[PDB]
């Protein structure tokens, strides 16, 4: 029914990946993609990021016990990265 996807994204010139996030352990709501900015890096990588995708790992980090704000920081940290690339393992149904 549900399956895991590894998504790999490089930020645009502004530093953004082109998606919005909701949830976190503070939000009593799993952590999920709420928006894909059309034609952004998140929309244009293969495989691509989808609205409603549940975030499982961020750069191999299990984020199930981290706050919303923490996860946003984890996302930003991957621009200062080695490959400057973001690697998300997501779950889709």
């Amino acid at each position: 029914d549900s399956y895991l996807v590894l998504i790999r994204i490089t930020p645009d010139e502004d530093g953004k990946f082109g998606f919005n996030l909701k949830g976190g352990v503070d939000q009593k709501m799993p952590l999920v993609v709420s928006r894909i900015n059309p034609e952004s890096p998140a929309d244009t990588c293969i495989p691509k990021l989808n609205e409603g995708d549940q975030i499982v790992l961020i750069n191999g980090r299990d984020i199930s016990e981290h706050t919303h704000d923490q996860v946003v920081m984890f996302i930003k940290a991957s621009r200062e990265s080695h490959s400057r690339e973001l690697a998300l393992v997501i779950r889709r149904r």
Partner: peptide, 6 residues
């Protein structure tokens, strides 16, 4: 109910 642009 937080929503953040990434």
């Amino acid at each position: 109910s937080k929503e953040t642009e990434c």
